Amino acid sequence: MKITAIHLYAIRLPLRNPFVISYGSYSDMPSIIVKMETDEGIIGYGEGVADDHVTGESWESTFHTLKHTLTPALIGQNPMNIEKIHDMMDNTIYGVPTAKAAIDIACFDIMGKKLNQPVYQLIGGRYHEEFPVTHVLSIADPENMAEEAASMIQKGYQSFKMKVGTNVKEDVKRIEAVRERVGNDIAIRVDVNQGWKNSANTLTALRSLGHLNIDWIEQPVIADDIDAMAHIRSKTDLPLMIDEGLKSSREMRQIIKLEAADKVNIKLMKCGGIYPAVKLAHQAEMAGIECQVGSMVESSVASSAGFHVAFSKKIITSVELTGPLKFTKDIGNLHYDVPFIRLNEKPGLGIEINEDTLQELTVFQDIVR
Amino acid sequence: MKITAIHLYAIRLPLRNPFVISYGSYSDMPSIIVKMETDEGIIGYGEGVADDHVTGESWESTFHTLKHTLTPALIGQNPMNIEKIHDMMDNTIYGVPTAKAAIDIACFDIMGKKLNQPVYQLIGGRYHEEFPVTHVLSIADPENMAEEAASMIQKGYQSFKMKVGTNVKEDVKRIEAVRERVGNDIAIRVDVNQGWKNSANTLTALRSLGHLNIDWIEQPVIADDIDAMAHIRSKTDLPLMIDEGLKSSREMRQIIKLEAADKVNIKLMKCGGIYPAVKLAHQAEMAGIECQVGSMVESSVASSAGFHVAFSKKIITSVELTGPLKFTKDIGNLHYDVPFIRLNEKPGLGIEINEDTLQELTVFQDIVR
Amino acid sequence: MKITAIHLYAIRLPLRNPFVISYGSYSDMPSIIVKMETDEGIIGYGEGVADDHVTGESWESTFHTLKHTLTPALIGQNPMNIEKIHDMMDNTIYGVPTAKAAIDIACFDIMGKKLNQPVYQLIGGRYHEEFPVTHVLSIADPENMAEEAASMIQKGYQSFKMKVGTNVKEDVKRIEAVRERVGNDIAIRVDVNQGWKNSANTLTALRSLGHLNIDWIEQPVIADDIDAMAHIRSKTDLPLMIDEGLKSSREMRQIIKLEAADKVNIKLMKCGGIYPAVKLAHQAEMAGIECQVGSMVESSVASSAGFHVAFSKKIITSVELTGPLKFTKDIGNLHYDVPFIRLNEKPGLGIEINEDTLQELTVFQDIVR
Amino acid sequence: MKITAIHLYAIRLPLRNPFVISYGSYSDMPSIIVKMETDEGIIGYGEGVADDHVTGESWESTFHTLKHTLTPALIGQNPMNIEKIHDMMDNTIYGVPTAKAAIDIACFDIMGKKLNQPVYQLIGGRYHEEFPVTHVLSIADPENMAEEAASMIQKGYQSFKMKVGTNVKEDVKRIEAVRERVGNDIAIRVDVNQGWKNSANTLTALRSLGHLNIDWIEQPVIADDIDAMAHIRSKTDLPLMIDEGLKSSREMRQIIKLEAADKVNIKLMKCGGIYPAVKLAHQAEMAGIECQVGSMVESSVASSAGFHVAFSKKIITSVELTGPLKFTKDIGNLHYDVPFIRLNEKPGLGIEINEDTLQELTVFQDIVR
Numbered sequence A, B, C, D: 001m002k003i004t005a006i007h008l009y010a011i012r013l014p015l016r017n018p019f020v021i022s023y024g025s026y027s028d029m030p031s032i033i034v035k036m037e038t039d040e041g042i043i044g045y046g047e048g049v050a051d052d053h054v055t056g057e058s059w060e061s062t063f064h065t066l067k068h069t070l071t072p073a074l075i076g077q078n079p080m081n082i083e084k085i086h087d088m089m090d091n092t093i094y095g096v097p098t099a100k101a102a103i104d105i106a107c108f109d110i111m112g113k114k115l116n117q118p119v120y121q122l123i124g125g126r127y128h129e130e131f132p133v134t135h136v137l138s139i140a141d142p143e144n145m146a147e148e149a150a151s152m153i154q155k156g157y158q159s160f161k162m163k164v165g166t167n168v169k170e171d172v173k174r175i176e177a178v179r180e181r182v183g184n185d186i187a188i189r190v191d192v193n194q195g196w197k198n199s200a201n202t203l204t205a206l207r208s209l210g211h212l213n214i215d216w217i218e219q220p221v222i223a224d225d226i227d228a229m230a231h232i233r234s235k236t237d238l239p240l241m242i243d244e245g246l247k248s249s250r251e252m253r254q255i256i257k258l259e260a261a262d263k264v265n266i267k268l269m270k271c272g273g274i275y276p277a278v279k280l281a282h283q284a285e286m287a288g289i290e291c292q293v294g295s296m297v298e299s300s301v302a303s304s305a306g307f308h309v310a311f312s313k314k315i316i317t318s319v320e321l322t323g324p325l326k327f328t329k330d331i332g333n334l335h336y337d338v339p340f341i342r343l344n345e346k347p348g349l350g351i352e353i354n355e356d357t358l359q360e361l362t363v364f365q366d367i368v369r
């Protein structure tokens, strides 16, 4: 099998409501779509949703990295040899996990369609039957966050992820409000997106959250400070998750060496795709670190890819890919059974791409041969 | 797909010459063969070559562990869901990597035959085109070891693994003899199989091997002493490999934490098969530890499985599976191109099993339904 | 003062001869030039030479990161407030040091021209009067490297940097050849550009270089492995320098914590410009780590900026910016007095930009207002 | 530019009320003023307020160190080359940060006046717009401290620094009294000035301060014991600041290595001036340690210099320079907008020196040419 052409689509996914977190507000979600063609007629779809604040990659930079740097060398290569494909991309350019992920996902889609098997059957098989879906609440005034939670509870949601990180006192008030409104039978996890910056602010914040039954605190400090995460962990009994601070095996090695976390948020966009994500899961398993497969808020394409990894591993105990539930328009048709997510048994990513929607959301594109 | 039956064959592979190492001498190699049948008619072959001195598993103990403990629960399960199969086996019984490997290998053979792809294409794809083959020299008097090396050099061999470990002074004489006979353009690695026992004896031995150009020293101390390996590594510049001291991710975690090795000998019989072997490779990669896929001296079945793992990973830089070259009779037909090993592109393990040879070597058997 | 417009020029600097190192060969050097205009008429020039293999930034990706992400927010900002400018860029996007450097350099050029002072007078003043210039020898056969060295010695060079990293045995032969040809009164430093990959290969290589009087060994292992650098340092007495393994203060923190290096190669393209480079120098000084200001092979623009940092700090004891000596065409006119480099006392970067040459080398451009 | 003469003035700044802390009581504040003249007519003012208990420098010792040791070598040197000036002073004499600071500040005043820019524009530019001003309460009976706080609250103060450190039980009573009187919307930080001496006394004290909402505890133990600070930090969740224990980069290195503090009080008088202070800020930033620029209670001269550093760095989040608010007479005219401090945009330190006041407060003086 040989790659004959790679279509690149710079699209923008419309959000029902702006997604607001500690480091930024998103009115919509720019994404790069990959359509990989082969000499055998088998097509594969990939996606790269870049988050400037996490990996230093942007919508436009990713489009061009793919067009001028990554894809040229890929023409003629076999999508089935994923280890080789990744070695070639890594030898060509360091980092750029989001760009590499777009390629990796398309290769797996092709592999599954070629072998007529779901992607999860190719990376360990099916392990999970379903996962609960967690609703992510954007930053807002305490009462506003509490009201949205109540509203989503009527929709069937039983697990929430609270976005905080602007001011410790205010963040504590936000969390108290939500917990008070939903009761103690609703799951709540808190994501600071680096907002508390250091261990002192974090430990002070944690002093007021012990009685609120928080499942875990995610990335309270600046990404680069793994040392601070380990220090906080030595002084609190609340589970800690690292997100922005974990991208590749480089950071996983440090997290393990320093005992810096109880959980890690593995994301295809941070490590380079399905293949690197599986390696990270295997590394975390060695150290008994629980894993979650999150996302940058992606379309059905990358979201499906993430689930295929999650459903194939026992060490992955939670998932956070809800882009399709946030967008008013999607190029794929990944189906959710809120409050649960299950995967069908169709080939590859197991979804269908609406060509009309794809072109409708495309701002600019190119084809590399 | 469902497993309908599992045939267990207790066989004995005949050796041209006894294989002699530090901890024992083998006149032949007892092995357990697995023939897995499915409701779809697809058959898979697995193999478990137990080494009592390494994993505490024996020929007979493995046969019975498979018959009474592992296989019963496997009937009805899907061989394609390898993560699930391993979780079930692990939940049933701790350890017994050789017994689990026999099952794991058969599952992959079935997966490849079902998808009409070589096993390596299912665990990362093809990365390597070939590997040099290293001839293992059994322990013997210095001149006798040097003569066999000269003899094998005429056969095309250009890489040798010297078995030593009975007495430091004598082991040094053995190594000096071989190097002196073959010249400095021949690769030589030394395997002590725990023979020097501790760091003091090892460091004393290493003082006399600096000018002999040894590629690496393998397992100089007792298996359980990872601390000693790290101590030796802090005081020598000769590459160190751990074998018996590494079985599962439990020891890999320690090796990484303590910086105890430059290389590790990963073996399907020590970790439970292809799936666990891949996880170990991923873990080693994180820490920059070079990997080799060795063996316990196995038939074409397990030897092929080992190569499928090796050929799919960049981190695996050497291989040591030469059972087929040591036996006067083999149940499989794995082909070697001494001094090289290449893999064909046939489905599954890519080999053919000679039913007549299998029954000829069988001492006792059973079928579990 | 306010930034009114930023011109972006995607150019390609022609090389007299291809520059060849362990990870790649360069026929020419693609660069992004920044021309910053202000409401006061003061113009500033910046430059971003991206090295895909070091920071995950490319020629095209950098052009677009600047055009769509970094520059828009900069319009209206005061170039004089460098701390603020960097905070804004960092809040906008993580990483992308090369893109940020192009902006930072232009700001300093404007600051110096506005205050009518050389850049070095604005970041500590002049400390050094001159620095010796080291000729970088691209990878080639031992005799070919030795001959080029002899040739450059006639040109006045008395210090050489040998590029190696393809094979330990061959690299040792290259180094032996050069030292043997130039004698022992010529300075030689060796740069492996990650070629030896790990500590085992590195320590083996170092065993044969003790009698060759090598000033220091630069980046022998893969960039991400700071642990390996510390391990090598614990077992050798040859000075060690980290290059690709050091980009931002994140890695400097690890290098200091782990005692991983004797020297570090600080580069504007790896940390984001003059301002971040000064911070890194201050951090290294605290731990007694010697610093060198290297480069990615840049035009007079970025090369001058690098020297301005070097000449202002006692902790910076060597420099490696020779792009202007390697290109057959340059947009700036930085003057070298081989075997020495001195800086004039003109405002800003102290050089003149040839508009005709700039346009001649431009492949594509844009202006952001 | 060349230094032509340096005037040294030994003055005494009158205090409205005696300043009382754990290690001493001050009826007034002896200070050394520096008036630096240049061949260009540009004059610069510097100041050295020695605290015998912190750096081992005294009013008289500093006057003489400047007159006989530091200034002679400075005559003829260029004030613009600060890195060089500091290297010369350091090569001449180790330590004496207060004496060196007096020189460093005058050089920066000249640099800013020469380039017609505020000092902050020369060391990173303006980052902050304003800082809240914290009123320092001298040690006194609990009720007396509580009353002064109430009184200053009417003056507009909303942040207080409580001086304690004579007896744990009594110090706790002092803190309880003040918090009870001002309510919970007033910021309070506690400075023990080494009064609790060790970790046992400190941890016992902290047991009773958890419910009083203290922003941070400053220097509870003896200066030289960084180990004790790290031990306390491992057993408390109250933010810890080091003051007397931090002088030069020597102690910063230890603080970072041992994770001994959440915050550090950087002072020009402890490190040698503006230039060394900036280096310390850069070092702290690497480790995520928050910085504050404090003072020894200085005139507008040194106080202004301190603010210029603070206003130029994001890592500096608080300031403590209130000498001008404590003295009944000042030689400079630094303006405060209680409860805030803002900096004008005038050249150099941006203040005016009253020659009449200077001579009025001078006890003895000299001129070095």
Ligand SMILES: NCCCC[C@H](NC(=O)CCC(=O)O)C(=O)O
Residues within 6 Å of the ligand: A019, A021, A026, A050, A051, A136, A191, A193, A243, A294, A295, A296, A297, A298, A320, A321, A322, A323
């Ligand atoms: N690129 C937009 C910001 C994504 C933030 C990121 N993702 C989410 O919070 C939502 C993930 C999901 O439910 O898909 C995170 O975990 O921080």
Ligand SMILES: NCCCC[C@H](NC(=O)CCC(=O)O)C(=O)O
Residues within 6 Å of the ligand: B019, B021, B026, B050, B051, B136, B191, B193, B243, B294, B295, B296, B297, B298, B320, B321, B322, B323
């Ligand atoms: N079970 C018999 C002893 C096997 C010893 C084991 N294997 C070998 O030495 C030979 C491996 C091979 O070439 O297949 C080892 O590496 O120590």
Ligand SMILES: NCCCC[C@H](NC(=O)CCC(=O)O)C(=O)O
Residues within 6 Å of the ligand: C019, C021, C026, C050, C051, C136, C191, C193, C243, C294, C295, C296, C297, C298, C320, C321, C322, C323
């Ligand atoms: N981007 C092209 C590769 C640059 C390699 C880089 N620079 C040099 O070797 C030459 C630096 C100089 O002399 O300017 C390094 O130190 O490794």
Ligand SMILES: NCCCC[C@H](NC(=O)CCC(=O)O)C(=O)O
Residues within 6 Å of the ligand: D019, D021, D026, D050, D051, D136, D191, D193, D243, D294, D295, D296, D297, D298, D320, D321, D322, D323
């Ligand atoms: N030299 C007299 C003692 C100064 C004590 C020193 N400074 C202060 O407490 C007041 C600082 C200020 O507000 O200027 C400290 O922080 O301990």
Ligand SMILES: [Mg+2]
Residues within 6 Å of the ligand: A191, A193, A218, A219, A243, A244, A265
């Ligand atoms: Mg997150």
Ligand SMILES: [Mg+2]
Residues within 6 Å of the ligand: B191, B193, B218, B219, B243, B244, B265
């Ligand atoms: Mg062995």
Ligand SMILES: [Mg+2]
Residues within 6 Å of the ligand: C191, C193, C218, C219, C243, C244, C265
């Ligand atoms: Mg280099």
Ligand SMILES: [Mg+2]
Residues within 6 Å of the ligand: D191, D193, D218, D219, D243, D244, D265
């Ligand atoms: Mg203090």
